């Protein structure tokens, strides 16, 4: 399995990625995903117990859920992987992610409904089933809540902390896992998901097909990160109330731990991957 | 400690918060919310993006529908 930059397909491979998701979607099996990503991210709380999101595990939970998809793809054809979208080089609405062929574009300004794309309502074949409201079209609004997506120069200072992270491992915490997923600092992975809007800017933000695509970036910003840090692992390591210990295992899955996931090699490679260097 | 309970017309849609830790409300449908660590809300429906209080999640949420009903969780 190669994890490949989304503006790198060729047409075929756009085809075929588009063609498998549409066919989880008809098959009832999509939703199911909304579903389960809604359920954690209501559910992990600063105070509370925290799997999903607001905590150390936010990486690893994000990667077993996304191998999940990448499998279900898989079922429907074995060609096609999971594409990752550089929002740092890929950051206006011009990028080919956001055209006809692909994801479609952003929502008109009247009720942000997506007019173009295999997954604009119009087609008949993208509902929006599990929803916090009465809409069932897709929407977005591209730039609309926030002017810009981040910069590569801050991506960079982001990949530079080197620690994983840091009690109280919450939204409050210093360190990476916090700043990469953007409650504290200049705000990366948060900040993309106001910058699309619609769906993927609430709990049931797998909706909108970019979910993936996003978290495909996240998840190889960690594996950044780690090149980078060969020295630092995750934490914590033990006894920690209410929070995913390197050797506990995850809900909803229970059968993985963070620590069957850290090495991301024994399931895919990217495209490219910097290997350690100074 | 809780914040203040409030009610209002916003948009043409009425919006209420309460301590419960806190429940808010969209024309009496129940709108999840969460408290972050630093003190600030965000909602199901903008779940990324914290603001300072209840209120302005309701607020928030009433202009993220655009007249939609909201679906109770
Ligand atoms: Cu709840
Ligand atoms: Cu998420
Ligand atoms: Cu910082
Ligand atoms: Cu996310
Ligand atoms: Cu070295």
Redesign the interface.
């Known amino acids: 399995t190669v994890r490949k930059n989304q503006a790198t397909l060729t047409a075929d491979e756009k085809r075929r990625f588009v063609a498998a998701v549409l066919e989880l979607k008809r098959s009832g099996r999509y939703d199911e995903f909304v579903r389960t990503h809604?359920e954690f991210?209501?559910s992990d709380?600063?105070?509370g117990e925290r799997t999903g999101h607001?905590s150390p595990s936010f990486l690893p939970w994000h990667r077993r859920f996304l191998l999940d998809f990448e499998q279900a793809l898989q079922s429907v054809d074995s060609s096609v992987t999971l594409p990752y979208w550089d929002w740092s080089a890929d950051r206006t609405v011009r990028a080919s992610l956001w055209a006809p062929d692909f994801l479609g574009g952003t929502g008109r300004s009247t009720?942000?409904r997506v007019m173009d794309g295999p997954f604009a309502a119009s087609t008949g074949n993208w509902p929006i089933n599990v929803?916090?409201?009465?809409?069932t079209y897709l929407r977005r609004s591209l730039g609309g809540?926030v002017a810009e997506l981040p910069t590569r120069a801050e991506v960079e200072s982001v990949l530079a902390i080197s620690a994983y992270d840091l009690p109280?491992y919450?939204?409050?915490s210093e360190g990476f896992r916090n700043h990469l997923e953007?409650?504290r600092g200049v705000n990366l992975?948060?900040?993309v998901?106001?910058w699309v809007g619609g769906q993927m800017?609430?709990?049931?933000?797998p909706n909108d097909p970019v979910f993936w695509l996003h978290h495909a970036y996240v998840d190889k910003l960690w594996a950044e990160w780690q090149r980078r840090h060969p020295d630092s692992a995750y934490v914590p390591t033990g006894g920690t109330p209410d929070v995913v210990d390197l050797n506990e295992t995850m809900k909803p899955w229970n059968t993985v731990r963070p620590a069957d996931l850290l090495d991301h090699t024994a399931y895919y490679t990217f495209d490219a991957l910097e290997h350690h260097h100074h | 400690a809780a914040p203040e309970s409030f009610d209002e017309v916003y948009k043409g849609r009425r919006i209420q918060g309460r301590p419960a830790g806190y429940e808010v409300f969209v024309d009496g449908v129940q709108l999840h919310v969460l408290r972050n660590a630093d003190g600030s809300w965000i909602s199901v429906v903008s779940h990324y993006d914290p603001v300072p209080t209840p209120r302005a999640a309701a607020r928030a949420a009433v202009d993220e529908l655009q007249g939609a009903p909201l679906l109770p969780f």
Not at chain 1, 131 to 135: I, L, N, P
Not at chain 1, 201 to 205: I, M, P
């Open positions: 809604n991210i209501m709380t600063d105070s607001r009720d942000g929803r916090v409201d009465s809409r809540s109280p919450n939204s409050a953007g409650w992975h948060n900040r998901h106001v800017a609430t709990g049931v933000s």
